[PDB]
Design a protein around this ligand. Structure first.
Ligand SMILES: OC[C@@H](Nc1ncnc2[nH]ccc12)c1ccccc1
Ligand SMILES: [Cl-]
Length: 167
């Protein structure tokens, strides 16, 4: 039993809700919140901009030190950093950004990172400003993630569209 509330159950392990991931994380304080990161951990917009703003830029400060030490992530890769005031940990995961020409096949690799954590609050990878089809992102999530994932979908039209189209 966990403290996530109001989620629709899609499969044994995947749950979905129309919610603002920032507000959800502040309420639940999950062990892991997933950020829709880029390889440079430059948290400008979308989910990343929102999560970073909610940390008063502490996420960006920590991320800049991480990059200065380790260099960029790989597309499809991840790193674990602090969750600041939002969660115990933040799993920064890089899905392919279609608006940069990156290979959508890497979306499965990106979701594989979730399997290293028993429970996660997460967005749909490569959705929104990363330019992939969200119906496809949800399908890849369900077919790749085996741990317990609570998906927060920003827009109601799409939340409603994803449920009604879910197979
Ligand atoms: O991953 C992309 C996803 N983005 C977010 N998901 C949940 N909460 C969020 N808060 C701020 C951004 C954000 C998204 C899906 C459909 C339409 C637009 C954006
Ligand atoms: Cl977005």
């Amino acid at each position: 039993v966990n403290s996530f509330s109001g989620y629709l159950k899609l499969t044994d392990n995947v749950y979905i809700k129309n919610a603002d991931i920032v507000e959800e994380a502040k309420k639940v304080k999950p062990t892991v919140v997933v950020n829709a990161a880029n390889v440079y951990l430059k948290h400008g917009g979308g989910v990343a901009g929102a999560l970073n703003k909610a940390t008063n830029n502490a996420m960006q400060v920590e991320s800049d030190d991480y990059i200065a030490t380790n260099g960029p992530l790989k597309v499809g890769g991840s790193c674990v950093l602090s969750g600041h005031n939002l969660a115990k940990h933040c799993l920064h995961v890089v899905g392919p950004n279609v608006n940069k020409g990156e290979d959508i096949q890497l979306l499965k690799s990106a979701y594989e990172n979730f399997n290293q954590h028993e429970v996660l609050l997460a967005p749909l990878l490569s959705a929104g400003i990363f330019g992939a089809d969200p119906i496809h992102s949800l399908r890849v999530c369900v077919d790749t993630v085996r741990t317990n994932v609570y998906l927060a979908v920003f827009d109601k039209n799409l939340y409603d569209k994803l449920v009604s189209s879910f197979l």
